[PDB]
């Protein structure tokens, strides 16, 4: 889901981080 | 079980079955069953009636959902009725609200192509 | 204008088997260049062959390929704006390629759920002479059969 | 608007975001490298001249 802003995969693609993709640990 | 305005989802995980309500989505889903204290991976098939009652009582209250909040959302757009702003006119003409590109695309609000030709 | 006859590409033999054929099959399974997932699926299906039949997958796979081999195929050729279809023989290289290709394709044509069980079953069906690939093989030979008229155009 | 426009590019007052880059050799406002203070056009000219210290053709 490279364009969904609610996945670790979409957050990768977008670049930014967040709740669905925390800044590690 | 007729939780809010709906009842449909049977044998398909309560954290997922919950999603089938305008107002629940995915975040409020697990948030509701951790706050009610119910196992997410359950059958949804009318399990313990007590868990279902607590779930219903919490969910249906707390926050607005289903036909009621659809009315509120529609009313928030009705806000820009009167002598409203620019954003209202975009809801009037049927065009994209956030000022995007309308030269091409914007089919999700304009609808299918009409073709003028000339 | 093919000055060079384009030498035949050679592969690396697999693990546990040493096949000069199985790896070619794993390659066709491979999508997006993930040989890991590809090889796994085949070896998975090899484990699946052991269940439904007490046969070693090295023969089940081998015989399946042998049953999905086009003896002769139809070839569209010359004179009349390329109007004819001469039925030509098939080179051992091409029988090789078609066998594995039709296998994987027919395998993913099956209504099953897991890629491994599709591969395993399609191989078992093909080993018997029943697979959807065998259909494809027998079909291509029908076309080649019906064109024996101007087959003497040959080449 | 070109002469009075290379004036503003060096004048740079009134709000910090109204200030912008601008090739010095030319007056180009686009493709201006911060490193040289030059547009991509001028930079290529001088690089072939040899007037750019260390700057050399890239082959690899």
């Amino acid at each position: 889901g490279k364009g969904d802003r609610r996945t670790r995969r979409g957050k990768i693609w977008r670049g930014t981080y967040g709740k669905y993709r925390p800044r590690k640990k | 079980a007729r939780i809010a305005g709906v009842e449909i989802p049977r044998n398909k995980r309560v954290d997922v079955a919950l999603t089938y309500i305008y107002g629940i989505g995915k975040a409020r889903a697990k948030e509701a069953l951790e706050k009610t204290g119910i196992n997410p991976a359950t059958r949804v098939k009318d399990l313990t009636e007590a868990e279902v009652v607590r779930l219903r009582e919490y969910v249906e209250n707390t926050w607005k959902l289903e036909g009621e909040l659809r009315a509120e959302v529609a009313a928030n757009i009705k806000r820009l009725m009167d002598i409203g702003c620019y954003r209202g006119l975009r809801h009037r003409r049927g065009l994209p609200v956030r000022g995007q590109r309308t030269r091409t695309n914007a089919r999700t609000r304009k609808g299918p192509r009409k073709t003028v030709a000339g | 204008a093919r000055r060079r006859r384009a030498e035949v590409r050679q592969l690396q033999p697999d693990l546990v088997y040493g096949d000069v054929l199985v790896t070619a099959f794993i390659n066709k399974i491979m999508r997006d260049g993930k040989k890991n997932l590809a090889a796994r699926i085949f070896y998975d299906a090899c484990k699946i062959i052991q269940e439904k039949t007490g046969q070693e997958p090295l023969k089940v796979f081998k015989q399946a390929v042998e049953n999905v081999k086009p003896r002769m195929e139809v070839r569209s050729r010359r004179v009349g704006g390329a109007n004819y279809q001469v039925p030509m023989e098939v080179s051992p290289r091409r029988q090789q390629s078609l066998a594995l290709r039709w296998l994987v394709q027919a395998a993913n044509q099956r209504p099953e759920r897991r890629a491994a069980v599709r591969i395993a079953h399609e191989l078992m069906d093909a080993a018997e002479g029943k697979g959807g690939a065998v259909k494809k093989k027998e079909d291509v030979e029908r076309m080649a059969e019906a064109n024996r008229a101007y087959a003497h155009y040959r080449w | 608007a070109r002469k009075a426009l290379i004036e503003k590019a060096k004048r740079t007052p009134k709000f910090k975001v109204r200030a912008y880059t601008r090739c010095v050799r030319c007056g180009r406002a686009r493709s201006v490298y911060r490193f040289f203070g030059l547009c991509r056009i001028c930079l290529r000219e001088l690089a072939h001249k040899g007037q750019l210290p260390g700057v050399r053709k890239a082959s690899w």
């Binding site: - | - | - | 203070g37 001088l46 001249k49 040899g50 007037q51 210290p53 260390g54 053709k57």
Partner: protein, 206 residues
């Protein structure tokens, strides 16, 4: 056509730089602008010398500047002017060690910039261009050259029709790296427009 600048094409091996100094960021930009304004200021009141090069070297407030000239006639003995405030007027926006040297380019007929500049003067003298090209080439070839090539392009002898006059004797291999090929260029300003003169001078290498 489309051909790369035979100077830039070398730069590394064969034909070194023309401004040899090292700096990191926050400095390169300022020192390059100053460097170019030196080249700009020199070219003006030193054209009568006809300068083949303007080498520049630096070492923290040191700024050395070497001016190559066919005939350094405009230097005239120490306090005979043409150097004093002239090499001192540089430090009116610099204030650093304005060390200005003067070189004697021996044969101007083997210096590409000088050749092209002599030709571009002749265009403005209203000379017959094709004959001017021929002579300049032979003149370069007369002074021991291994190969030469001069090119004037556009608006030749006035007349509404852009042309391109071409002449080249001996050997001029532009593609080769071990070339030692000197390249010069000049703008001829005319009452009917502007035309460009290319000059290629070649010597052996290995």
């Amino acid at each position: 056509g489309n051909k790369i600048h035979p100077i830039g094409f070398r730069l590394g091996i064969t034909r070194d730089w023309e401004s040899r100094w090292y700096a990191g960021k926050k400095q390169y930009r300022h020192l390059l602008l100053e460097d170019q304004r030196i080249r700009g200021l020199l070219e003006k009141e030193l054209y009568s010398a006809g300068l083949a090069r303007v080498d520049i070297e630096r070492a923290a407030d040191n700024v050395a500047v070497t001016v190559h000239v066919a005939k350094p006639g405009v230097v005239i003995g120490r306090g005979g002017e043409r150097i004093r405030v002239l090499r001192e007027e540089l430090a009116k926006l610099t204030g650093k060690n304005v060390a200005l040297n003067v070189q004697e380019v021996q044969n101007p007929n083997l210096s590409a910039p000088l050749v092209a500049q002599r030709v571009a003067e002749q265009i403005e003298r209203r000379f017959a261009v094709r004959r001017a090209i021929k002579q300049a080439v032979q003149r370069v070839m007369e002074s021991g050259a291994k190969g030469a090539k001069v090119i004037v392009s556009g608006r030749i002898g006035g007349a509404e029709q852009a042309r391109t006059e071409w002449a080249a004797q001996g050997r001029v291999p532009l593609h080769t790296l071990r070339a030692n090929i000197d390249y010069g260029f000049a703008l001829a300003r005319t009452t009917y427009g502007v035309l460009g003169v290319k000059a290629y001078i070649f010597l052996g290498e290995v």
